[PDB]
Paper text:
Structural and functional analysis identified IPO as a member of the JRL family but with a different tetrameric association. The monomeric IPO from residues 1 to 154 shows a typical β-prism fold found in the JRL family, with 12 β-sheets (β3-β14) and 2 additional short, extended, N-terminal β-strands (β1-β2). Four IPO protomers form a compact tetrameric association by swapping their extended N termini from residues 1 to 10. Thus, the wound-inducible protein IPO from sweet potato has versatile carbohydrate binding properties and might play a role in plant defense.
The crystal of IPO–Me-Glc was determined to be a monoclinic space group P21. The Matthews coefficient and solvent content was 2.26 Å3/Da and 45.5% for 4 molecules. In addition, the resolved structure of IPO–Me-Glc formed a tetrameric association. We analyzed the tetrameric association of IPO–Me-Glc. The 2 extended N termini from monomer A in blue and monomer B in purple swap with each other. Consequently, a larger buried interface between monomers A and B is 1,522 Å2. In the chain A of IPO–Me-Glc, 9 hydrogen bonds are formed by the residues Gly21, Tyr97, Gly141, Trp142, Tyr143 and Asp145 of IPO and the atoms O1, O3, O4, O5, and O6 of Me-Glc. The atom C7 of Me-Glc is involved in the methyl carbon (Me)…π interaction with Trp142 of IPO. In chains B to D, the Cd2+ atom forms 5 coordinates by the O atom of the carbonyl group of Asn19, OG atom of Ser18, and 3 water molecules. One of the 3 water molecules forms a hydrogen bond with Asp145.
Author numbering:
A (entry chain B): 2 to 154
B (entry chain A), C (entry chain D), D (entry chain C): 3 to 154
The structure:
């Protein structure tokens, strides 16, 4: 059959630091839900352990959180519209530089930041007219690094 | 400190350009793969979509966004590390898509599943490595597929 | 001031595995491509290597690391933006490699150059975009090739 | 043998987004790197562009597309397998870019070359591998850098 070259989306990032495992999630349908899991409490200090990305039913993935630290606080984000940017803070946690906070911005609403808004700032932006259709990164016990896939609207 | 994070090497993709690019590289091993078809096992099976998953949770389905009703499904319980995939590419309703697929682990072979006809593809990786994810293009069907690999 | 760095979308590769992965995406436009072959134009041409270059200095050569002497070269001076690449894939001395290649801009066509016979390949990008670089696999010959692209 | 082609694993990028995405992964070893600066060796050197090469043919220059006059260059003749890169990121004329860089091979070290200040970066690869190419973002300066690596 004709070998019609298949395409791979452009990427922005990753930011943060190297983690034991590389991960990627780029669903065919829009990303519509994000669940961030923390240890600690919102009245004290939040420690981001894992992130869960989902697209409609069935499509879902959880990165970070393979360690023993119990989860004690979850934040559910229901995305309305197209994500165009994500930002947050990077800092050391129990020995590793990881994503400590995170904020999702769509062309309609703003969600976050969530977590410990302290440390080194990061900002994943894409050219005007594009949208984020996925995420990839490095992770282990925690979320070491994050990057995004993007394509024209 | 900005300590460069890594991205696994890739093999492929093979097949044809499709409407959407897709990627699924879970942090835990792949353990289950569900293939959905139209047609029938007694005659000819038409591969429509593929579902990849890793326990617990972690799942994705590619292809199958169209109106064609599904009529059959085959669940592959992955035993071991996937070291290669192969199959056939043939035309279907106007497009060239993945028509058959076989998963090979050091422990056993699964497939080929689907329709054994068309152009053969073969995704092999260097010895000592294992496939830890898949990526590709898809729309109504599975247009293209490729794999992520790393040291075992 | 401190945003994450970007990587261009990719289309491909087409062809088959080769010993070395190669990549060339210069900061300035691809304006000269030199194709090196064995054999002769009055007979059949065997593509051995390809040289990509961007104005002075920026240059790379893939394939052709074998001992087979080159007896024919085709120089292509690209006028505008390359939006498509096509050609043929076929066996050469026990290897499936790029045998033929044609470059297409918005107003001109260059080639095909080489041996027009085998399995056809085509690298197309979404309208409004342009090819800004290439990647693939190579060794003695040119095993596979893919393109980097971005908006005009 | 019709096997899918492979793409080397990646580490990075580090630094900040830049106008152009760039990539250079030659088939043969990288045996020479030239760093071009403005300023002076006695005071502060400002990294403006980096030139990578393998043999007198494969060469690429990233950064330096601006009118800023160069005033110093440093040539690094790599002896062994480059297994690590490091340096500093800092502001220069309103841009966060690579200001310092150091190359480490399986034999010796080269650098740090450039200005001391800013955020450190480190591109390290798993044991047993080596850097076979580099990619990143650039404009008037070198905005971001990453490495392609494979088993040595
Ligand atoms: C506790 O160590 C584990 O978790 C951290 C954090 O996510 C990873 O960086 C590391 O590679 C993994 O082995
Ligand atoms: C029927 O057309 C749809 O499905 C095919 C196949 O999977 C895709 O290639 C195409 O882009 C999409 O629009
Ligand atoms: C002759 O063998 C060499 O050249 C061929 C073709 O380029 C490559 O596929 C192969 O890996 C390399 O070792
Ligand atoms: C002067 O501006 C130019 O050079 C800087 C630094 O290289 C790039 O970041 C920017 O995108 C490009 O347009």
């Amino acid at each position: 059959a004709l070998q019609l070259a298949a395409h791979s989306d452009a990427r922005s990032g990753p930011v943060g630091s190297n983690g034991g495992q590389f991960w990627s999630f780029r669903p065919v349908r829009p990303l519509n839900k994000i669940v961030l899991s923390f240890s600690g409490s919102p009245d004290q200090t939040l420690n981001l352990i894992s992130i869960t990305f989902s697209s409609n039913p069935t499509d879902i993935i959880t990165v970070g959180g393979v360690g023993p630290e119990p989860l004690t606080y979850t934040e559910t984000v229901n995305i309305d519209g197209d994500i165009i940017e994500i930002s947050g803070m990077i800092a050391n946690y129990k020995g590793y530089n990881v994503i400590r906070s995170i904020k999702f911005t769509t062309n309609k609403k703003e969600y976050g930041p969530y977590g410990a808004n302290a440390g080194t700032p990061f900002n994943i932006k894409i050219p005007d007219g594009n949208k984020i259709v996925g995420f990839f990164g490095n992770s282990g016990w925690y979320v070491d690094a994050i990057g995004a896939y993007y394509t024209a609207k």
